Amino acid sequence: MFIWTSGRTSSSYRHDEKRNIYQKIRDHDLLDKRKTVTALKAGED
Hints:
mainly alpha; Cytochrome C Oxidase, Chain M; 1 helix; metal transport, membrane protein; helix; ion channel; cytoplasmic part of; metal transport
């Protein structure tokens, strides 16, 4: 979806390496479907 406004900013989305890791771990879960069910939650604090 394009933009109607105007005020392009910096990356901070593709740059940061720790910003493109989430899609990684989740990729490791795809192989957990067989492993035990959910466990040890994680979010904030």
